[PDB]
Scaffold this active site. Sequence first.
Site, mmCIF file in Angstrom:
data_model
loop_
_atom_site.group_PDB
_atom_site.id
_atom_site.type_symbol
_atom_site.label_atom_id
_atom_site.label_comp_id
_atom_site.label_asym_id
_atom_site.label_seq_id
_atom_site.Cartn_x
_atom_site.Cartn_y
_atom_site.Cartn_z
ATOM 1 N N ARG A 21 -8.390 -3.212 -1.197
ATOM 2 C CA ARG A 21 -9.465 -4.016 -0.850
ATOM 3 C C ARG A 21 -9.323 -5.301 -1.113
ATOM 4 N N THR A 47 -0.774 2.586 9.753
ATOM 5 C CA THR A 47 -0.252 1.447 9.794
ATOM 6 C C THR A 47 1.254 1.538 9.413
ATOM 7 N N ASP A 65 0.874 -1.366 -0.059
ATOM 8 C CA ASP A 65 0.146 -0.040 -0.050
ATOM 9 C C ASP A 65 0.846 1.422 0.060
ATOM 10 N N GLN A 75 -19.652 -0.978 5.043
ATOM 11 C CA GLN A 75 -20.946 -0.180 4.683
ATOM 12 C C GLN A 75 -20.349 0.836 3.554
ATOM 13 N N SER A 90 -14.656 7.464 6.876
ATOM 14 C CA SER A 90 -14.991 7.165 5.351
ATOM 15 C C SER A 90 -15.244 8.373 4.580
ATOM 16 N N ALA A 125 -3.750 8.681 4.980
ATOM 17 C CA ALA A 125 -5.044 9.525 4.433
ATOM 18 C C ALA A 125 -5.957 9.947 5.463
ATOM 19 N N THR A 126 -6.293 8.746 6.321
ATOM 20 C CA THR A 126 -7.211 8.927 7.137
ATOM 21 C C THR A 126 -6.778 9.790 8.226
HETATM 22 C C1 LIG Z 1 -16.289 6.095 -1.436
HETATM 23 C C2 LIG Z 1 -16.057 7.555 -0.572
HETATM 24 C C3 LIG Z 1 -16.909 7.405 0.603
HETATM 25 C C4 LIG Z 1 -16.037 8.801 -1.730
HETATM 26 O O1 LIG Z 1 -17.491 8.969 -2.040
HETATM 27 P P1 LIG Z 1 -18.123 10.089 -2.057
HETATM 28 O O2 LIG Z 1 -19.665 9.954 -2.086
HETATM 29 O O3 LIG Z 1 -17.915 11.282 -0.889
HETATM 30 O O4 LIG Z 1 -17.611 10.841 -3.303
HETATM 31 P P2 LIG Z 1 -18.046 10.472 -4.856
HETATM 32 O O5 LIG Z 1 -18.937 11.420 -5.317
HETATM 33 O O6 LIG Z 1 -18.622 9.316 -5.259
HETATM 34 O O7 LIG Z 1 -16.579 10.543 -5.544
HETATM 35 C C5 LIG Z 1 -15.729 11.818 -5.317
HETATM 36 C C6 LIG Z 1 -14.935 11.724 -6.794
HETATM 37 O O8 LIG Z 1 -14.199 10.647 -6.646
HETATM 38 C C7 LIG Z 1 -13.916 10.038 -7.748
HETATM 39 N N1 LIG Z 1 -13.778 8.584 -7.834
HETATM 40 C C8 LIG Z 1 -14.654 7.726 -6.982
HETATM 41 N N2 LIG Z 1 -14.138 6.473 -7.266
HETATM 42 C C9 LIG Z 1 -12.957 6.575 -7.961
HETATM 43 C C10 LIG Z 1 -12.018 5.358 -8.309
HETATM 44 N N3 LIG Z 1 -12.263 4.071 -7.992
HETATM 45 N N4 LIG Z 1 -11.106 5.988 -9.154
HETATM 46 C C11 LIG Z 1 -10.995 7.223 -9.590
HETATM 47 N N5 LIG Z 1 -11.791 8.381 -9.057
HETATM 48 C C12 LIG Z 1 -12.748 7.840 -8.191
HETATM 49 C C13 LIG Z 1 -15.527 10.188 -8.473
HETATM 50 O O9 LIG Z 1 -15.508 9.872 -9.791
HETATM 51 C C14 LIG Z 1 -15.769 11.579 -8.044
HETATM 52 O O10 LIG Z 1 -15.231 12.664 -8.953
HETATM 53 P P3 LIG Z 1 -16.494 13.459 -9.855
HETATM 54 O O11 LIG Z 1 -17.278 13.733 -9.045
HETATM 55 O O12 LIG Z 1 -15.310 14.415 -10.590
HETATM 56 O O13 LIG Z 1 -16.803 12.335 -10.876
HETATM 57 C C15 LIG Z 1 -14.381 7.590 -0.469
HETATM 58 O O14 LIG Z 1 -14.104 8.721 0.572
HETATM 59 C C16 LIG Z 1 -14.043 6.128 0.218
HETATM 60 O O15 LIG Z 1 -13.491 5.272 -0.460
HETATM 61 N N6 LIG Z 1 -13.989 5.989 1.755
HETATM 62 C C17 LIG Z 1 -13.813 4.983 2.301
HETATM 63 C C18 LIG Z 1 -12.543 5.033 3.143
HETATM 64 C C19 LIG Z 1 -11.293 4.318 3.204
HETATM 65 O O16 LIG Z 1 -11.356 3.310 1.912
HETATM 66 N N7 LIG Z 1 -10.265 4.364 3.888
HETATM 67 C C20 LIG Z 1 -9.068 3.309 3.647
HETATM 68 C C21 LIG Z 1 -7.796 4.110 4.181
HETATM 69 S S1 LIG Z 1 -6.251 3.036 3.949
HETATM 70 C C22 LIG Z 1 -6.480 1.450 5.089
HETATM 71 O O17 LIG Z 1 -7.588 1.639 5.715
HETATM 72 C C23 LIG Z 1 -5.320 0.764 5.041
HETATM 73 C C24 LIG Z 1 -5.633 -0.789 5.890
HETATM 74 C C25 LIG Z 1 -4.469 -1.553 6.130
HETATM 75 C C26 LIG Z 1 -3.313 -0.903 5.804
HETATM 76 C C27 LIG Z 1 -3.066 0.020 4.796
HETATM 77 C C28 LIG Z 1 -4.256 1.163 4.648
HETATM 78 C C1 LIG Z 2 -6.221 -0.500 12.884
HETATM 79 C C2 LIG Z 2 -6.474 0.291 11.864
HETATM 80 C C3 LIG Z 2 -5.548 0.664 10.641
HETATM 81 C C4 LIG Z 2 -5.748 1.260 9.622
HETATM 82 N N1 LIG Z 2 -4.739 1.619 8.442
HETATM 83 C C5 LIG Z 2 -4.857 2.711 7.813
HETATM 84 C C6 LIG Z 2 -3.869 3.445 7.223
HETATM 85 O O1 LIG Z 2 -2.602 2.747 7.295
HETATM 86 N N2 LIG Z 2 -3.823 4.455 6.635
HETATM 87 C C7 LIG Z 2 -5.051 5.222 6.256
HETATM 88 O O2 LIG Z 2 -5.280 6.014 6.031
HETATM 89 N N3 LIG Z 2 -6.060 4.802 7.040
HETATM 90 C C8 LIG Z 2 -5.936 3.580 7.966
HETATM 91 N N4 LIG Z 2 -7.193 3.033 8.588
HETATM 92 C C9 LIG Z 2 -8.549 3.740 8.618
HETATM 93 C C10 LIG Z 2 -9.689 3.097 8.015
HETATM 94 O O3 LIG Z 2 -9.806 2.914 6.823
HETATM 95 C C11 LIG Z 2 -10.922 3.764 8.849
HETATM 96 O O4 LIG Z 2 -11.031 3.775 10.189
HETATM 97 C C12 LIG Z 2 -12.257 3.373 7.925
HETATM 98 O O5 LIG Z 2 -12.455 3.980 6.610
HETATM 99 C C13 LIG Z 2 -13.041 3.986 8.862
HETATM 100 O O6 LIG Z 2 -13.276 5.582 9.320
HETATM 101 P P1 LIG Z 2 -13.627 5.911 10.701
HETATM 102 O O7 LIG Z 2 -12.931 4.899 11.606
HETATM 103 O O8 LIG Z 2 -13.518 7.319 10.599
HETATM 104 O O9 LIG Z 2 -15.034 5.549 10.892
HETATM 105 P P2 LIG Z 2 -16.459 6.463 10.311
HETATM 106 O O10 LIG Z 2 -16.195 6.795 8.874
HETATM 107 O O11 LIG Z 2 -16.949 7.256 11.602
HETATM 108 O O12 LIG Z 2 -17.610 5.451 10.550
HETATM 109 C C14 LIG Z 2 -18.432 5.140 11.499
HETATM 110 C C15 LIG Z 2 -19.730 4.272 10.878
HETATM 111 O O13 LIG Z 2 -20.482 5.009 10.186
HETATM 112 C C16 LIG Z 2 -20.528 4.132 8.889
HETATM 113 N N5 LIG Z 2 -20.760 5.046 7.709
HETATM 114 C C17 LIG Z 2 -19.975 6.074 7.529
HETATM 115 N N6 LIG Z 2 -20.139 6.566 6.123
HETATM 116 C C18 LIG Z 2 -21.252 6.043 5.591
HETATM 117 C C19 LIG Z 2 -21.856 6.211 4.841
HETATM 118 N N7 LIG Z 2 -21.805 6.802 3.624
HETATM 119 N N8 LIG Z 2 -22.875 5.081 4.386
HETATM 120 C C20 LIG Z 2 -23.295 4.058 5.559
HETATM 121 N N9 LIG Z 2 -22.572 4.059 6.499
HETATM 122 C C21 LIG Z 2 -21.529 4.967 6.702
HETATM 123 C C22 LIG Z 2 -19.291 3.238 8.698
HETATM 124 O O14 LIG Z 2 -19.236 2.249 7.938
HETATM 125 C C23 LIG Z 2 -19.300 3.047 10.393
HETATM 126 O O15 LIG Z 2 -20.092 1.925 10.660
HETATM 127 C C24 LIG Z 2 -6.796 2.063 9.525
HETATM 128 C C25 LIG Z 2 -7.886 1.947 10.569
HETATM 129 C C26 LIG Z 2 -7.443 0.987 11.570
HETATM 130 C C27 LIG Z 2 -8.415 1.050 12.816
#
Ligand SMILES: CC(C)(COP(=O)(O)OP(=O)(O)OC[C@H]1O[C@@H](n2cnc3c(N)ncnc32)[C@H](O)[C@@H]1OP(=O)(O)O)[C@@H](O)C(=O)NCCC(=O)NCCSC(=O)C1=CCCC=C1
Ligand SMILES: Cc1cc2nc3c(=O)[nH]c(=O)nc-3n(C[C@H](O)[C@H](O)[C@H](O)COP(=O)(O)OP(=O)(O)OC[C@H]3O[C@@H](n4cnc5c(N)ncnc54)[C@H](O)[C@@H]3O)c2cc1C
EC number: 1.3.8.10
Lengths: 380, 380, 380, 380
Positions: free
Chosen positions: D242, D157, D91, D367, D131, D124-125
């Site tokens: 993912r 991480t 990543d 979600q 989310s 990023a977070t």
């Molecule tokens: C889906 C989301 C809620 C954006 O939705 P929203 O409803 O707010 O926005 P939207 O209106 O749908 O889109 C806005 C614009 O984006 C663009 N676009 C969209 N997709 C695209 C794509 N595939 N490719 C390109 N572009 C893409 C759209 O086309 C659109 O642009 P436009 O208007 O010009 O057309 C986003 O913030 C999300 O994924 N949050 C999840 C958090 C998360 O994943 N955190 C993980 C953190 S890491 C982790 O956890 C770790 C763990 C382990 C160790 C390592 C790490």
């Molecule tokens: C141990 C650990 C490691 C991680 N590693 C990485 C890292 O290396 N780098 C990085 O950037 N991030 C990292 N992540 C972050 C991680 O991706 C987030 O915690 C995750 O996106 C959720 O965000 P949040 O914790 O703010 O929860 P929130 O976004 O506050 O979510 C709270 C609740 O609301 C629900 N919710 C929120 N939005 C919606 C919606 N639109 N529709 C329906 N339900 C919704 C969620 O599903 C959840 O059930 C890590 C997190 C943890 C705990």
Amino acid sequence: MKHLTEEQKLTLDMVRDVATREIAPRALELDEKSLFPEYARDLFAKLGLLNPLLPAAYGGTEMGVLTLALILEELGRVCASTALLLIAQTDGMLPIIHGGSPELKERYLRRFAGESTLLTALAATEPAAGSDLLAMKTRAVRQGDKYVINGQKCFITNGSVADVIVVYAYTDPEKGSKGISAFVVEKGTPGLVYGRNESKMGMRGSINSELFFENMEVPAENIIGAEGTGFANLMQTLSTNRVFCAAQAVGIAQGALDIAVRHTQDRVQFGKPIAHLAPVQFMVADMATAVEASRLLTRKAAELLDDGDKKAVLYGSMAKTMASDTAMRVTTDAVQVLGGSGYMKENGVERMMRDAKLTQIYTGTNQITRMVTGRALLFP
Amino acid sequence: MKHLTEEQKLTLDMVRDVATREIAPRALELDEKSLFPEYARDLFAKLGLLNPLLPAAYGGTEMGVLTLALILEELGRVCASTALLLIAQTDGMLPIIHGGSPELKERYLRRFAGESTLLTALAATEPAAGSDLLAMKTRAVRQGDKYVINGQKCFITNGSVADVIVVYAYTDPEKGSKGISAFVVEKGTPGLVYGRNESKMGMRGSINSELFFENMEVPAENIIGAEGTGFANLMQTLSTNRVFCAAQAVGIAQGALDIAVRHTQDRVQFGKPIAHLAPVQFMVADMATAVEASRLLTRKAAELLDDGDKKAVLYGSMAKTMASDTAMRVTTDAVQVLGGSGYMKENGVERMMRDAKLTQIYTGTNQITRMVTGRALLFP
Amino acid sequence: MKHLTEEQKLTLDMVRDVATREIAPRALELDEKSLFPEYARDLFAKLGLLNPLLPAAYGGTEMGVLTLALILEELGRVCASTALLLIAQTDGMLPIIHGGSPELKERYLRRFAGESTLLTALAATEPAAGSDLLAMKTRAVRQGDKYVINGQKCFITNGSVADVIVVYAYTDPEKGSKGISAFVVEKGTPGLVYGRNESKMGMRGSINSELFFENMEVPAENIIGAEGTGFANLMQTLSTNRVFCAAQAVGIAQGALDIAVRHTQDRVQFGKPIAHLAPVQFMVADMATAVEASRLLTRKAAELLDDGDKKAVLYGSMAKTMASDTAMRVTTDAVQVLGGSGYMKENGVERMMRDAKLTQIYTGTNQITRMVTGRALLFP
Amino acid sequence: MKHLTEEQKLTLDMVRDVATREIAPRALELDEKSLFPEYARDLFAKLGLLNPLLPAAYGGTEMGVLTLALILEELGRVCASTALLLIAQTDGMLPIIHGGSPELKERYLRRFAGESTLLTALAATEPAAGSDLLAMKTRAVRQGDKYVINGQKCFITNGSVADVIVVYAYTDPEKGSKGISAFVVEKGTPGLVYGRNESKMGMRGSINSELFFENMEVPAENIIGAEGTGFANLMQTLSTNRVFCAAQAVGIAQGALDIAVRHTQDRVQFGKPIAHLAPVQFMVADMATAVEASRLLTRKAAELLDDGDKKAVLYGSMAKTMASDTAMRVTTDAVQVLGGSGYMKENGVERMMRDAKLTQIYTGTNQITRMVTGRALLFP
Ligand SMILES: CC(C)(COP(=O)(O)OP(=O)(O)OC[C@H]1O[C@@H](n2cnc3c(N)ncnc32)[C@H](O)[C@@H]1OP(=O)(O)O)[C@@H](O)C(=O)NCCC(=O)NCCSC(=O)C1=CCCC=C1
Ligand SMILES: Cc1cc2nc3c(=O)[nH]c(=O)nc-3n(C[C@H](O)[C@H](O)[C@H](O)COP(=O)(O)OP(=O)(O)OC[C@H]3O[C@@H](n4cnc5c(N)ncnc54)[C@H](O)[C@@H]3O)c2cc1C
Ligand SMILES: CC(C)(COP(=O)(O)OP(=O)(O)OC[C@H]1O[C@@H](n2cnc3c(N)ncnc32)[C@H](O)[C@@H]1OP(=O)(O)O)[C@@H](O)C(=O)NCCC(=O)NCCSC(=O)C1=CCCC=C1
Ligand SMILES: CC(C)(COP(=O)(O)OP(=O)(O)OC[C@H]1O[C@@H](n2cnc3c(N)ncnc32)[C@H](O)[C@@H]1OP(=O)(O)O)[C@@H](O)C(=O)NCCC(=O)NCCSC(=O)C1=CCCC=C1
Ligand SMILES: CC(C)(COP(=O)(O)OP(=O)(O)OC[C@H]1O[C@@H](n2cnc3c(N)ncnc32)[C@H](O)[C@@H]1OP(=O)(O)O)[C@@H](O)C(=O)NCCC(=O)NCCSC(=O)C1=CCCC=C1
Ligand SMILES: Cc1cc2nc3c(=O)[nH]c(=O)nc-3n(C[C@H](O)[C@H](O)[C@H](O)COP(=O)(O)OP(=O)(O)OC[C@H]3O[C@@H](n4cnc5c(N)ncnc54)[C@H](O)[C@@H]3O)c2cc1C
Ligand SMILES: Cc1cc2nc3c(=O)[nH]c(=O)nc-3n(C[C@H](O)[C@H](O)[C@H](O)COP(=O)(O)OP(=O)(O)OC[C@H]3O[C@@H](n4cnc5c(N)ncnc54)[C@H](O)[C@@H]3O)c2cc1C
Ligand SMILES: Cc1cc2nc3c(=O)[nH]c(=O)nc-3n(C[C@H](O)[C@H](O)[C@H](O)COP(=O)(O)OP(=O)(O)OC[C@H]3O[C@@H](n4cnc5c(N)ncnc54)[C@H](O)[C@@H]3O)c2cc1C
């Protein structure tokens, strides 16, 4: 996911075309009026689709299980009853294909060559013997150059219309799983008697027969394999049937999903299509994921069967359970997605829900398939 | 669980007797032939069961919601369609009982006194307005001493046969939830037109109507409450309807469970009744527990309604969702428990599964009821 | 839902106060450092809460099972470990209360009168005998005026700290369910040996002991009831324990739900609190409904126990299964609702999920409780 | 299921060997004492396993996503934390690999060549932006030949130990999804400040960092791609992440299943191994089927990613949701299968259940992944 031959790809394009243009428009009426799918049976015969597993040596296309699975998914999408025709037809022939002598295979499979429209059936189940197939009571007694068969079968798909029925009976009740034999029984044999065609919740575009054998004589040369091998022949046939059930269920689930998806794009509430509502998005997500997972498990199981791989038992059991469960859940939910309209006969998805239920029960219920799967995993 | 009065206990013993001796034997035919439950309607009228919430002041028995809930569980056990008669009948009268002027109540509820066999209906839903009831298009325009009503309704239970229909319409489209009014509309009013009676998956022993209002004049004095209060009147009526749906669902689930249980005791496979098999025991356990949980949630919700307790909204929504989900799951599984026989029309449990599906959709779908519940918990 | 006496209402108000002000702030540390809840045990003794089922005749408050259930729901809300103290304490005394002679009851229950801080334990489980309690190996041999006990027990809650332990052993191995007896064993008896205190996933604010009995002599007058009645005594004690497990699970689920709910109101994403998102509303709806259903099943089961009603077995089994399942699901989801924060030790809901798991296993697993329930329904 | 190259087959045999002989024995202690997996990181570097997606052009093995997925399934089987090392490492490099200029790629990826032990992280977070990643507050202002970065990140991480961190920040807050940029930030940059390493429910053999940027200057040439392309770069990186989460979840579920299976063969109750009990067979069946379905969905998603196929978004989202759900369910049940022992820290399956929970939350919660999936299906 084996690369498909060009022959398989052409077959499947044609099936998709026929499903869409000819099968889909007929399905409402097929259910409403409880019709055998005669038009489909005749069309499938003309197109080389009625008997896909008939070996080339007997005039058949010898497509393999993977191909039939893909066919079943396309048909199940639009008409579960029309898929069931193909399941029953192949099932009724598989005991002969895989157990019969050269002489018996030639004698009884030749008539299914080419564009034949003759039908088969498989008769194992009895009132006393559903999940417990070893409890079957039908008996076959050798008398000279004949066997004399006495008993009954129920829930036999196409039973009353099959030219050729494979009947399982005990030749030695005392030997249990080694005392069952299997027999070719021809339509028109004196002593073969048809009972009721029972009315079902779904898959009503079908025939579901009760059979009775009253001092029914068949030539000794109609036995399939040696005496006492019939239970293994039956179990092998079921291993393959289960994958066909799974494929049909994948299709049912997909066809209901497709109608749900289109409804979400067209149905406006709260000022936008309902596709805009996150809970609808979530429902459709969960539906599509279970169909795809079931599709993948089913295609893996079919491939293992074609490859002759021992693991096919395990994977086919998991595919049957998971794809039928999925059709039951996805159809229940696709009715939900259509709301009030989903409950109306005119919109199709209620029939697919009624159809889906059967896939949890036939070819062995999902409680038996879980037993088979669990046994295979714990006692490998 | 309030102590039941002796009047409630006598009523419920009689209902259980009628359900068992008269309603249960009729239910197969009621579905098979899509029959209005005339015999039941007439018998219920004679016994004082057709209109249990009619106030004493208008010749009614004024039993309360808890009593009707218990009645609905007994009827739903044996005939979901016959329960639905009682739901629609009470629903169609509740807007007048709880919103109408003294004069209007006397004018239109008197005819339901005693052993009357006249019917009611509630007409809110439209093709454009299902979950989004604020999207309804039917309009009522004041012209002198009359309102002129134009629009349509669909999925109206008993619509084409009701003597008295409560129609919801906009008197001021611009005011939204404050611009709907509710009207008494009598059978025989010029301008009232019946459409199709639609064919459903289940609850087929019923009438499901489309209504059209073509320059339909009703006297100004037929308005229920003041102009613009109709949306609140509708929402209050639905709060109570949801508990009746929940009760019917509890009954459906119980009736299917009872047939599953008896089958496990009678059906022998592997040498003993299938009740002996631990997986069957587990299925029946999970079924019975969800029915009991749904029963308890429903009885609590009904009591809160009778007590006038604000919490009834929350608990009724949870009871509707949970008891309908439970009827869908338990019936799906009771078909499973009966195996092949469960899929046959003659054994009843397939109809109860078709019936169960509707309880997830009507009185508001389970996605709306989850919204209502979640809103109440998060925005108290 | 019996009307609560004023004594019960005062007790429960006090418990809610103590839970909130004293128990809740301690729970993080209790888990983090694996602490016996000494402060709670001492406070509960002073307040009359340590031994709620001790009969008045022995200086106890004799509150009944319903009261303890309500107490368990309040404590489980904030500290599953502190609830477990009360479960183990009551469990260890119930075999004596309901089986012991007048003389034995006076001899061993008097020391628990009033504000006593002495502890009990119940020792049935063995490495060889978990779900199959009849497989226990511990033996008691009569020698004169003593029994000589040899064997072992494991997973004994509070075992190493109990003043009084109820040990189940075979007095006649050949008689099976009629050959087990039950014995009072005192802390300090020569031959009683403590093993390890094992490290658990959750409920870590507790003691989980291995016991060994090495030629351990107890007076003949320490037998509870007659020889061979111990299995029935154990089964009766478990019937009641199961309702206490169910109550604790209801509390766990509620406490996690409450934290989820508050998080949805405070956590803003996409410009509003997440409570505004329909999928979050749906999750909370489903969570609250399962807690409420579990709460109702548990309160019905406890009431049936207090009433001495045969149906308590059935309902207690359904309440244990359903309330533990619900705590497992609801806590899993409450972690989900808190997102990343939900996975962090500082926010509590991860501990409640670890705690919840145990409720599916102890007092008999949910596979055994489903067996008990299914048996009761199919073989009434 | 693409045919694996001989290079992939050799790699995977070696991984399985290392997982079994070196990783598995360490996992208990790694969790118990909350240890970074230093031995694993060093061993993986020596074996060419630390950086499998590093391109050959920068001294890497350039294995592809399918290979890493298979690796993640093997590691997740025995140590979810050790798998997470590989997820975070890959990543943190993927934004540079797929967005950086030739010059930037050479400048920062060269140091990861060969047996390098340097680490990456992806930041990023934020507390305000989980989310809702568009809600991030970190800002980067161009000042001459530098960017000045101010803000914070959480849950990163390996954050505090990474040599190279990819930080996402707004360069133009007003432009929303077009106003985020991505930056290479090196360990040792003045202005980079580490916060707490937070204590988690599971995956405790890891580092989970808070980062602060206090007037932190980075050279202008450290920008990844052009200003405003960072949100698309992030979304592309998540699409691939993912699938890695899904693979790890498949492994977790499999490792718990394997321990459940072995326990059923060894644990005797009621006189035989518990594998003989049909309910245990059913549990194991359902567990194995969901693992296999999740495995197939994950392998299809990884292949689509390697092929550059647009459908990878949809399938990766379905694989993440389904494989994480499956790990949560299967681990919950594998604890169940081990009964009391399953709840004990020494037997491992409790840790895998704690680990499993995280897979439902990170890389975007289930979600959000359901939203992504549903959107893709309804708005193709
Ligand atoms: C889906 C989301 C809620 C954006 O939705 P929203 O409803 O707010 O926005 P939207 O209106 O749908 O889109 C806005 C614009 O984006 C663009 N676009 C969209 N997709 C695209 C794509 N595939 N490719 C390109 N572009 C893409 C759209 O086309 C659109 O642009 P436009 O208007 O010009 O057309 C986003 O913030 C999300 O994924 N949050 C999840 C958090 C998360 O994943 N955190 C993980 C953190 S890491 C982790 O956890 C770790 C763990 C382990 C160790 C390592 C790490
Ligand atoms: C141990 C650990 C490691 C991680 N590693 C990485 C890292 O290396 N780098 C990085 O950037 N991030 C990292 N992540 C972050 C991680 O991706 C987030 O915690 C995750 O996106 C959720 O965000 P949040 O914790 O703010 O929860 P929130 O976004 O506050 O979510 C709270 C609740 O609301 C629900 N919710 C929120 N939005 C919606 C919606 N639109 N529709 C329906 N339900 C919704 C969620 O599903 C959840 O059930 C890590 C997190 C943890 C705990
Ligand atoms: C599993 C079952 C309960 C047998 O279990 P039991 O516990 O009683 O018995 P058991 O002790 O496990 O085994 C006995 C012996 O069998 C052998 N053997 C086992 N498997 C074998 C194999 N694969 N191959 C070879 N042999 C196999 C064993 O090795 C063993 O022999 P052994 O002692 O010498 O070693 C069986 O009766 C069953 O499948 N019932 C389901 C009913 C069903 O499927 N009905 C579908 C009807 S059609 C339909 O519905 C349609 C629909 C659509 C249109 C078309 C049709
Ligand atoms: C919930 C709903 C979507 C309204 O939500 P929305 O998001 O659009 O709107 P909103 O913004 O939340 O509220 C607007 C205003 O309403 C008010 N208000 C709300 N609740 C109230 C209450 N309880 N009491 C009083 N008032 C209540 C609010 O306070 C608010 O007013 P405000 O701004 O001034 O404060 C609604 O249309 C619904 O229930 N649809 C389901 C359809 C359905 O049930 N159909 C069943 C048909 S019958 C059947 O099927 C049969 C079967 C069997 C045989 C017999 C029949
Ligand atoms: C159900 C069971 C498997 C016995 O079934 P089986 O199939 O082997 O045997 P069976 O054939 O059904 O019955 C044999 C005889 O028993 C009699 N009998 C039956 N029920 C009776 C009743 N209610 N009352 C009276 N008698 C009853 C029967 O009538 C029959 O006698 P019969 O032939 O003369 O007629 C049993 O061992 C069990 O409950 N295991 C679960 C383990 C468990 O609960 N452990 C929890 C440990 S504590 C805990 O965890 C803690 C946590 C927190 C802190 C505090 C503690
Ligand atoms: C429309 C239709 C078409 C069919 N077509 C064919 C056909 O062409 N030819 C043919 O021979 N048969 C046919 N089948 C028969 C079918 O396979 C059976 O109905 C099925 O095996 C179940 O048997 P049963 O109906 O006797 O149910 P039972 O075996 O009585 O099952 C009753 C319940 O007990 C459960 N149960 C039974 N045994 C166990 C066990 N050991 N463990 C756990 N649970 C168990 C079952 O799962 C079920 O839930 C068909 C059936 C139908 C309804
Ligand atoms: C047999 C029958 C009898 C009935 N009897 C009565 C009657 O007597 N009188 C009367 O007025 N009405 C009656 N109803 C109508 C009934 O209440 C509705 O059909 C129901 O409200 C759903 O509306 P719809 O069918 O337009 O579905 P839609 O509202 O189009 O729903 C389609 C799908 O979208 C989902 N959806 C819609 N809105 C949302 C949202 N905001 N969030 C999440 N999901 C949502 C729904 O849950 C459903 O899954 C009856 C219906 C039937 C079929
Ligand atoms: C922390 C803790 C505290 C406890 N406190 C007490 C205490 O104070 N005193 C006391 O005596 N005991 C106590 N228990 C013991 C507890 O009740 C048991 O662990 C429980 O009965 C399960 O036994 P087991 O662990 O041997 O699992 P097993 O019986 O080995 O179960 C293994 C698996 O087989 C399944 N299985 C077993 N039999 C069947 C069957 N017939 N049908 C279907 N599935 C089955 C189980 O459900 C489980 O999934 C406690 C246990 C724990 C962990």
